[PDB]
Write a protein that binds this ligand. Structure first.
Ligand SMILES: C#Cc1c(-c2cnc3ccccc3c2)c2c(N)ncnc2n1[C@]12CC[C@](NC(=O)c3cncnc3)(CC1)C2
Ligand SMILES: [Cl-]
Length: 313
């Protein structure tokens, strides 16, 4: 069968954490910011510390440690990695501090200062992260703008491995059981049949790109989740965002095709968005795109792609 997972689960003493201040609480438990000073070494590492709503539940530590397992096994610049766990009564997961927060809130707060270059770069980076997960045979099952974090405005990473599952070594799908799920980011075949593939993640990527291009709009705003599968069966989809050229919207629509193998692959999404990122104003139309601030080969140029963006399976 599958190859041995030789990742290191690092256990971190509680005396190594300092300046602990709360970032947010409620639905996802409680998230703190802090500093991590490892024992012998003269370094201070900004970190975020996650932990469920106080509690001591045996059902809860099972899910937390499933997340830790996945998050400890990933090493990519566009995926968040687990630094370690701390073994308090409910288990604490420790990761890198992402000072700018989640990408959904970032695009909402900075609507009027986000240029086309940033939007298309984020799309590339998210596609790189997702392609990496695909190479590790992992199906995320919860890709959305709320689950992308911002290290800097130039550098985002995918997070939230709570729902992630391994698509088998010889197998090509996953069949799920009960729980709560985000209907509005899900492929049709996931809603009806609980089938989950790399290609169901591509659907979710489409919806994530739509959220970014609409500067944080709620998909299918007003429509209740029980209606969504009927809407999608009729052939309705999310509308073309104001800023989007047909080129960009056509990529989104391809992610929402009924036949899953007709959707783009993450590797192709990397290529397409990377091309668009070299001439951003040709693909997104944003008022005041020159005045945007945040903290002969010319015949060839159309289809030029750097080798770093041309990825082999
Ligand atoms: C969820 C989370 C999260 C994570 C994270 C994710 N997954 C994790 C998995 C394992 C272990 C740790 C994990 C940590 C995170 C982070 N690493 N670094 C900065 N922030 C983060 N957040 C946020 C918590 C509150 C927040 N921001 C605001 O509420 C806000 C800010 N400014 C004005 N208004 C509102 C939205 C998400 C930042
Ligand atoms: Cl394509």
């Amino acid at each position: 069968g599958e190859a041995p997972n030789q990742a290191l689960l690092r256990i971190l003493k509680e005396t190594e954490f300092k300046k602990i201040k709360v970032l947010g609480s409620g639905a996802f438990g409680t998230v703190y910011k802090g500093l991590w000073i490892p024992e012998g070494e003269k370094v201070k590492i900004p970190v975020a510390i996650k932990e469920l709503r106080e509690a001591t539940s045996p059902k809860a530590n099972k899910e937390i440690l499933d997340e830790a397992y996945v998050m400890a096994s990933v090493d990519n610049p566009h995926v968040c990695r687990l630094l370690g766990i701390c073994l308090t009564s409910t288990v604490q997961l420790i990761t890198q501090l992402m000072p700018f927060g989640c990408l959904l809130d970032y695009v909402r707060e900075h609507k009027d200062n986000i240029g086309s270059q940033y939007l298309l770069n984020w799309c590339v980076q998210i596609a790189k992260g997702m392609n990496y997960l695909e190479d590790r045979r992992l199906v995320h099952r919860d890709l959305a703008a709320r689950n992308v974090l911002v290290k800097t405005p130039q550098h985002v990473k995918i997070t939230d491995f709570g729902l992630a599952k391994l698509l088998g070594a010889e197998e090509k799908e996953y069949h799920a059981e009960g729980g709560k799920v985000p209907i509005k980011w899900m492929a049709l075949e996931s809603i009806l049949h609980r089938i989950y593939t790399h290609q169901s993640d591509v659907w979710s990527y489409g919806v994530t790109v739509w959220e970014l291009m609409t500067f944080g709009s709620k998909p299918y705003d007003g429509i209740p989740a029980s209606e969504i599968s009927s809407i999608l069966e009729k052939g309705e989809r999310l509308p073309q965002p104001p800023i989007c050229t047909i080129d960009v919207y056509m990529i989104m629509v391809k992610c929402w095709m009924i036949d899953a193998d007709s959707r783009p692959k993450f590797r192709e999404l990397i290529i397409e968005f990377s091309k668009m990122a070299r001439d951003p104003q040709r693909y997104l139309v944003i008022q005041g795109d020159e005045r945007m601030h945040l903290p002969m080969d010319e015949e060839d140029m159309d289809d030029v792609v750097d080798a770093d963006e041309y990825l082999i399976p």
